Each structure stands twice: as C-alpha cells, then as structure tokens.
Symmetry: C3
Subunit: 178 residues, 3 copies
C-alpha cells in the first residue's frame, strides 16, 4: 500500500494485470490514465476493466491533463498505462526522430512533471512501463534513442517510486519496497 | 523438490545446466523430452547427458507423445527441453506465420495439454524456456507474434508450476517457491 | 565488501553508477580500467569520475596490461568498464566476425586471464557488463555470435565473482552474495 508503484516488464510479462490488481487494491473507483494514440475514429478492442473505473485519454502532457481534469479528487487511485506509449508519442512528435536531444529533453520534462504531480497527489499511483534494454543492440538510430530514453524514464520513476516490481512470466520480483 | 519447475532465461543464461541439475535431483533415470526438429538424417552434436537418461524426441504434440509412450512409469522425473523450440515448431507449421490467431491458439492448446499431463503425472517435471520479451520491439510481424506467443506460454507455465526460476549469467533468481 | 563484484544490466540500467558507488566503497584511489576503443585522436566526452581515480585505457588483453602496469599496488580497488566493449573489441579484431570459434576462444582466454588476475589481486574488483540475451533472436550471425560470447563471459565472471548484481531501472537485484 505505497504511494507510488512502478511495475515494469517485457512483452507479455503480465505487468498490466498485476498493476491492475495493485490499483484495485487502491479502491473501487480508479482513474485509468491511458496514454495511447478527421471526422471519425476507429478503435481496437479495449481491455475489460471494472465498471466504476473512469478512463482518461491523454497521449501527451500527462501530468498537465490529469491535474487540469481535477479527477484526482473523485477517485481512490491512479493506474498509468503506460510509460512505454508515452515515450513513443514523445518520440514520434519531434521533427527529426533520428535526433536524440529534443526527444530526450521532452521526455524528461514529461517524467519530471509526472513525479511532481504524484508527489502532490492525494491518491496513490501505480505506473506501467516496459523493459526494452536487455536485448541485442539494435541498429536503427531512432530505435536506439527510444530505448535509451525509455530506460532513463524508468530510472527516474523507479527512484521516485516507493515500490518497484519487475515482472517475469506474470510473476513479480520485488526490486524495491519500503 | 516441487512437482513442477519452470526454469527460464535468456541466451547463454545457463538455464539448461540448472534445469539439468534439478532433474538430476529428481533421480537417476530421467526422461529428457527434446522438442527439437527423406532417407537419412544429419545431426548436430548432442549435449553429454547422463547414461541412465532416456531421450524422447517429439517436436509437436508433446503431451500426447509423452503420455502415449508410457515412459512416465519407468523414470524418476522429466526435463522438457524446451518450450522455446516447441513454440518455434508450432509457428513454422502454420500456413501463414505472419498471421497470429492460429499459431496462438495451437500453442495454447499445446501448453494446456502439457499442464494437464504434468498435473496427472506420477513424476515431477522441470521445463526449460527462454525469455525473449525484454528487447527492442522487433519489426517483423512473424517475429513479434512468436515473441508474444512464447511469453503467453511462459505465463501459463509459471502459473501452473510450483517453482519458477529466472536465470541471470548462470545464477538463479527465485521468482516463485512453495 | 567482497573481493570480486559483477554488476550487469541492460541499456540505461544504471549499472555504471552502481558499480562506481561500489568502487568508491573500495577507497579513495580507484583504478578505472576502460576497455573502450594516425596523428591525432578525437574523444567523446568522458564521465565525471573522481579526481583521485587513475584511468587505465586498455581495449584488449586487459589482464596483461593491468598486471604489467603494476598499478594494482598503488590503488585501493578496481572498476572494470566494461566487459561489453571488451567482447566487442575481441570480435571486431578477428579476420571473419561471422565465424564463431576464434572469437569465442579469444574471449574465453581474455576472461580466464581476468579471473586469474583478480584471484591474485591485492585489491578488490567491481566489473561492469551488459545483459543482451533476453531479446528477440537477432538474424545477423555476427550479432548472434557476439550475444552468445558476451553471455558466456558473463557466466564465467558471475561464477568467479563473490557478489553479482542485476540492474533493473537503476536498482539492484542481488543474484549472489557471500
């Protein structure tokens, strides 16, 4: 029952289900902050999440949107899904994604804003992120930069978080617990 | 000394040696179930495994073959080498490997059959699998699908298993122990 | 405060900072052994490491160079940065990098020499290496061989080391501690 929880893991590691159980532990009304991406919209099938949960779609400037919504004052907890897509959205919105500096600085501004919000938050947070740095060194410069930036974001979040879990095949290894 | 053991790890993580030590802990006669792939056969050099061990070659429908062999009634334990190649064989045998649904469902049927067999087994099992989901997101659709399917299989097996070990540089981290 | 420490992790895992803290724990004068690669030299900005630390540049035959320098008799501890670049230098110096055997044997000779030196060393060692085997199976033969060789080196070092740490998002998981 910590204030800030980071759950990270690889592809099909069960990180979403575990973070969702932590968030259900927060309470019955949960803010599911979804960072996913003219006239109409087509949507891929959404996960079957609880009925009392409210969903906040914000692909960029997550801390700003969540703070402006005021919804932190009507829920019991926050699940952020996920740091991975937030990094992806920050990269694909730069002018040159093969350049590292602007994307890195923008993602760091984003993560620092999230740390500020969570520290000042009345409800607890569980955040979902991916581990992508333990593979072969990819060749693409855009891809290497993305991997580096996500990893930096994960370091910053793990340091600010009270509990940090690393998922292997659906089961959590405790990295940090108060 | 649990009933079902899952040992997973990356490339050159020592998972095979550690699973083989667990299996040697099972007893002296071990069933080594090998899931590897016109007139003749050429073979790559096999690992030097104990003399009393019996080797069962079955690249697909592993639970069916092991059950039909009856060999669970003549050995002290089973080492399954490995879930990785079983997923690979299930993928490369579909009509279209760039399609996800058939491969996913076939691999899930395979893993569910293995869970059933192990639950009904008189001897214990140690299973070897790979962790492949902590790298950069690969581009190939066949490859992404394979990675997703292996990870799902690893979740199902870890949940059914009594002990789960994650290998780093030859040494085990305990993920789950009864 | 062990004799031989191995810190490994992925891209942007904080392994360098953590190994540097262990080394600062060794004492005030530390040998930073850097394995990085006609008339002049251009250099990328170096990390801001302590003033009393001495830096030894040796991209290949690390044990030989460190032993010949005699510097193990003027410092309080050694940080080796890093096994990853040492493997890379050993691979790129072979005639055919798509061939596995020569590179593998040369890297094993290198790691065995390092194990010998550390065992015979008056000061303790912390070594930095990368985990690269938990991603999708790469296609390139040179790349697959490199990944296999680094993983073998990490096994040998982890076995000889007294303490082994695996880094996730800047935080260490203890793999082995005396």
């Amino acid at each position: 029952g910590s204030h800030m929880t980071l759950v990270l893991g690889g592809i099909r590691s069960g990180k979403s289900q575990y973070a969702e159980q932590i968030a259900a532990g927060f309470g019955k009304k949960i803010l599911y902050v979804a960072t996913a991406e003219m006239e109409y919209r087509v949507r891929k099938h959404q996960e079957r999440r609880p009925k009392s949960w409210l969903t906040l779609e914000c692909p960029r400037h997550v801390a700003s949107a969540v703070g402006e919504s005021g919804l932190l004052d009507q829920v019991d907890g926050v699940i952020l899904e996920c740091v991975t897509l937030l990094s992806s959205n920050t990269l694909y919105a730069q002018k040159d994604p093969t350049d590292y500096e602007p994307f890195q600085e923008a993602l760091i501004e984003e993560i620092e804003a999230l740390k500020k919000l969570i520290r000042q938050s009345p409800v607890p947070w569980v955040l979902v992120s991916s581990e992508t740095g333990m593979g072969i060194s990819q060749s693409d410069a855009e891809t290497r930069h993305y991997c580096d930036g996500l990893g930096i974001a994960n370091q910053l979040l793990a340091k600010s978080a009270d509990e940090v879990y690393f998922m292997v095949a659906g089961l959590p290894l405790t990295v940090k617990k108060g």
